[PDB]
Design a protein around this ligand. Structure first.
Ligand SMILES: Nc1ncnc2c1ncn2[C@@H]1O[C@H](COP(=O)(O)OP(=O)(O)OP(=O)(O)O)[C@@H](O)[C@H]1O
Ligand SMILES: Nc1ncnc2c1ncn2[C@@H]1O[C@H](COP(=O)(O)OP(=O)(O)OP(=O)(O)O)[C@@H](O)[C@H]1O
Ligand SMILES: [Mg+2]
Ligand SMILES: [Mg+2]
Ligand SMILES: [Mg+2]
Lengths: 73, 73
């Protein structure tokens, strides 16, 4: 139940073998994340700062509780 | 005439003020580049390794000569 990574379109867009596991392709932890109760402006600022489009949202124990994307904005 | 940076869609996609200069928004050098005469395989390997969609090509003296993009592939 621990957030171990994140796998997006850039990771899979050139992989010819579609039978590979996620572990070989994913971006492993640590990640750029935000805590629970993050506002829209804070998430947008983080995304603009780190030049990313996704933002996992974790609790105080480091467990995954939410996800934010640029698609929302 | 020096290759001082690169500016892409991620840099500009949340800049409300369109009158800003390029320098205030661009990604400054050094950049992930390749040498002249780089094959398609090497360029694709660089793009996959660094998770980027562009690749400037400079000469032996560091002056910009060309560009490679994922659009080509
Ligand atoms: N929060 C994050 N922390 C760390 N790495 C991340 C994070 N979000 C995305 N990445 C990684 O950054 C790279 C690209 O990020 P992003 O998710 O914006 O790409 P994408 O949505 O696949 O892009 P495109 O839509 O242009 O194909 C990928 O390798 C992805 O795994
Ligand atoms: N060769 C490079 N070296 C270093 N940084 C780069 C290079 N090419 C692009 N970047 C930077 O990486 C970020 C995203 O790279 P990329 O050029 O793939 O984005 P993009 O094509 O705008 O993405 P999207 O498809 O999500 O709109 C931007 O901040 C951009 O300035
Ligand atoms: Mg995207
Ligand atoms: Mg995109
Ligand atoms: Mg893209």
């Amino acid at each position: 139940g621990e957030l171990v990574g994140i796998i997006t379109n850039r990771d899979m867009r050139f992989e010819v073998d579609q039978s590979k596991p996620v572990s070989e392709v994913m971006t492993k932890a640590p990640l750029i994340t935000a805590k629970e109760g993050v506002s829209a402006e804070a998430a947008l600022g983080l995304l603009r700062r780190h030049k990313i489009e996704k933002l996992p949202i974790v609790d105080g124990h480091g467990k995954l509780t939410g996800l934010i994307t640029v698609k929302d904005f």
